[PDB]
Design a protein around this nucleic acid. Sequence first.
DNA 1: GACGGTCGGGC
DNA 2: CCCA
DNA 3: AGGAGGTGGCTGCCCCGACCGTC
RNA 4: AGGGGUACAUUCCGCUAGUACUCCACCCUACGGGUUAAGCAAAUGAGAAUAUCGUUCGAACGGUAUUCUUCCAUAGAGAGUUGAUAUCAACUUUUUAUGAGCGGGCAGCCACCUCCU
Length: 466
Amino acid sequence: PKSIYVPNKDLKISKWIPTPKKEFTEIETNSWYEHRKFENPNKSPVQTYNKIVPVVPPESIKQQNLANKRKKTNRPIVFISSEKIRIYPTKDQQKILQTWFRLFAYMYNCTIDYINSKKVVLESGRINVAATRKVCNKISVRKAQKTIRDNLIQSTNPSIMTHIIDEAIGLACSNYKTCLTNYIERHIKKFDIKPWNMSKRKKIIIIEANFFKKGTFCPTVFPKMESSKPLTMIDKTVTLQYDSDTRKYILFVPRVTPKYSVNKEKNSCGIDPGLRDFLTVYSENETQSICPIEIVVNTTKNEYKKIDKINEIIKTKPNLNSKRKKKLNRGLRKYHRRVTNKMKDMHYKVSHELVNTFDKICIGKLNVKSILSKANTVLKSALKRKLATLSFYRFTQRLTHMGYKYGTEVVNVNEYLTTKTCSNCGKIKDLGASKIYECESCGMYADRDENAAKNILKVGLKPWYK
DNA sequence: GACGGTCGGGC
DNA sequence: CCCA
DNA sequence: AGGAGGTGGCTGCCCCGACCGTC
RNA sequence: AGGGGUACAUUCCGCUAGUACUCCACCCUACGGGUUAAGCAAAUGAGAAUAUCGUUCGAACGGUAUUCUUCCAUAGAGAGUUGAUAUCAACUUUUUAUGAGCGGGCAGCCACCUCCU
Ligand SMILES: [Mg+2]
Ligand SMILES: [Zn+2]
C-alpha cells in the first residue's frame, strides 16, 4: 500500500475541509469531556430512512445459532445486552453467598485440575488442542467429577444447588476452551488457568434462569431477596458478582431488547483518534473535535496525583503494617476505578452522540500496544499514561456495541499514512507533531487531525484490505 | 392425587 | 506506521 | 519489585423429564 | 478564596452539576490566635467487630487475615431530650411536600503490555 489516497469525487465526498483556525460551537456533553462542532457553511440536505434496531452482532448471531444447534428451544435470534441489577443480601444471605462463591471457586479449580490431569500433549509439549477440547466437554466432565462434586455439595448446611456447581464446571470448561483457542491460533505461547483464591477480589456465581422464581433466585434457600428491579422476568442465565473493592452484589442479567423501528440519517463519518484530541470527527456536513487532552489532564490531575503519591509512599516507606498497606492498596484501586469510570462514561456518551448523529462510523484502528510500547520513545512516559487510561480499545468495543444497539455500522480502519496523506491531492508529507497540515502542492490549509479523519472516512468507504 | 421445586443428565 |  | 491497570482474543448469556414435597 | 474526600429520595452501574458535612501550611502562643496563608501525604483517614498467634500485665500491645460504620438538602407539621422564662433557643426522631440531565453489555479466563515509584 504505497498510497491510501482516493480522490474525493470518486467517493462522492465534498472537497470541503475547514481551515485549522475556526470558531467552534460547543456541543452539550453533560459530562466532564468537551465536545465541539463546526457546521459546514454549505451542507447537502440530510437524508433519512427507516431502520429496525437493535441490530444483532454477527458473532452473537453465530453464538445463538450454535446454541440452537443443541435444540435448547427454537427461539428467534435476539440482541442480548447485560443489565446491572443490584442485590442487597442480608448478613445470613451474605454468608451463604460467600460460601457459595468459595464452593464455586473450589469446583472451578477442581475442573481445571481435572482437565490438566487429562490434558493430552501432542508428542511434544504442544497441546493436542482437539483432544483437550473433547476432554473439555461440560457433560463428560460433570459426569466424571460427580463424586467430588457431590462431596463439595454435601459439605455445607445451606448446600449449593447442583445446577450452580454444574454451571461452575461449564465455566471452567469454557475458559479452558478459550485458552485452547488462543493457543491453536498462536495468540498465546503458553497458558495456565490460575486457581481462584480467597482473594480473587471479584467472586462470581452463575445462576440458572430457572432458579428465578417467586421474586428471588433459588427460593428453596433464598425465599426472599431484595433487588433494584423485580426478578420475575429473567429468562436467561444470570451471573451474580461480588466486588470486594466496591462491596456490591450485582446481577448481570442478559436482557432482551425488543426490535423497533426508527429513522436514521445517511451520514457517513470518519474518526482519527490519538492524543491532543481524543477523537477528531470529520463528516461531509459537519466537523467535531472531542475531548482535548487539557481537560483530560484537568479531570485526571487529581487521580494521577493521588496514584503517584500512594505509589511513592508504598515504595519509599517500606516495612509498613499490612493494615496500612491494604488501606493504601484500596485507595489506589479506588482512584484507578474512578479514572476508569470517567473514561467509560465518556466512551458511552460519545458513542451515543456519534451513532445518533451518524449511521456509519469509520473509526481508525489505533494499535495502543504499539504506541505504548517502550520500543518507541516518540511519546514520553508521562503521556503514555494518559493514552493508556484513555482506554481507546475499550472505547472501540463500547462504540461498536452502541452502533449495533442503534443501527450504526462501526467500521474499523487502520490509520496508515492517514496523517501524512493529503486528503485533496494525495501528496505524502511528514510533519511530526505539527497541528496545521498545509499541503505544498494543492495548497490546502487544513487541520492535521481533521485531514486524518477525512482520510479515514475515505478509506473506510473503500478500504484496500478486501 | 395433583402443582411446583430441584436434580439428572442431554450433546 | 500510526501518538506528539 | 510490587502493585495497579490496560490490549486483544475467545466463550457464554440451557432445558425437559423424573422424582419428591405439599395439599 | 483555591484544592481533596464522604453522602445524596430521585430502580441499579456510573459521569457531569449542585448541594450538605469534613479535611489541606508556618509560628506558637502551641484546645485561642496571627501570618495573609493558600494548605496538595487533604479518607493514602477514623472507628467497631471476628479471629490466629508473640510480648507485657483473663486484659492491653503488636503483627497476619478478614470483615462491618463512616450521616441526603430545603421548607412545613408531630413527638421526644437539653438550656432559658405553659412559652422561646438548641439536639434526636415520625411524617407532608419540593429537590438538575446524560448515558449505560456485561461476566469469566488467558497471554502480552504500559504506568508510578
Ligand atoms: Mg491518525
Ligand atoms: Zn495536497
